[PDB]
């Protein structure tokens, strides 16, 4: 199975430029992104997919800014990036699921944001 360098949670404020939810596989072996599939889930919905065999990314309308850096995928980095407008409306637990042929794995990360009272 795929193993991860885990992070329980990440927090952002309006001081952050981009929201980054980390996901790092420590034992990737594929030498070509065609054999890789990445899926990020939020509240039981697929909110980002990278399908290596089609070389295609898919996001729903409520995560239009979501993406991963495909150039970092063979190193195991499947971190999700998004803008603050998408991030603030979707706080909570995200699941990063990576598949490399018969080897798969998932990890959960909580995206946190705190409303500042003044």
């Amino acid at each position: 199975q795929l193993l991860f360098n885990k992070t329980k949670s990440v927090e952002f404020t309006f001081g952050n430029d981009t929201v980054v939810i980390p996901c790092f596989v420590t034992n990737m072996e594929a030498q070509n992104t065609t054999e890789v599939y990445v899926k990020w889930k939020f509240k039981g919905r697929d909110i980002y997919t990278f399908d290596g065999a089609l070389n295609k990314s898919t996001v729903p309308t409520d995560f239009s800014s979501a993406k991963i850096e495909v150039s970092q995928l063979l190193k195991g980095d499947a971190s999700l990036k998004m803008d603050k407008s998408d991030a603030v409306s979707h706080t909570g637990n995200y699941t990063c699921e990576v598949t490399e042929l018969t080897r798969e794995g998932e990890t959960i990360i909580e995206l946190k944001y705190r409303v500042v009272s003044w």
Partner: antibody
Amino acid sequence: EVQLLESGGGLVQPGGSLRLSCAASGFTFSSYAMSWVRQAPGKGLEWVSAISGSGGSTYYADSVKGRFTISRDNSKNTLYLQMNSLRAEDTAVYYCAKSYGAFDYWGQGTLVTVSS
Amino acid sequence: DIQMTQSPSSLSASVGDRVTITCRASQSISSYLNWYQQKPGKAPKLLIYAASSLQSGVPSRFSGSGSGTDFTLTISSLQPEDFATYYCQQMHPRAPKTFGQGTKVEIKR
């Protein structure tokens, strides 16, 4: 060695319910997705259900969606299939299998016969 | 969903013959395809995973090839104990990981 021990099959009346069990051993159960595949008499293999290692994601074939529920108890290393509203077309040998993809290990199979 | 077209439906081949079975996927799935051998009323056994890797314990006379949409299972030199129905299976995570129709391999004698 890896073992997948099935139980809970057998004769059941049309419209009835059954709960299949699959006691796994020889591999880290919680690290893998698990599946159920069936074979009706004189028919091919039909994948029917799958569940992620944690149990957070479930998958079903359209032929069983709404009637079957897959679940797992990682503390007991056991996989379940709750089958409700059974019909004559659900008569098949049911197998549990390790993974949801390349099924490397399989249970022995248990015949489920939907008959009065 | 992804549909697999497995061919032929059945074949009869002599002991020592090469057996060739093919599977075509309706979409490009890179190496996400597996092959199984199934004896009647018994659990299938995984032969080839990820289109071209031999599963440990499987005899070297079995091999798989192909990537994308066109896949082939070969038995290089058929042994009498190799009679079975063989199945391809798509396993790309974009769709249900379903089996092909199967090919019944009979021993000609």
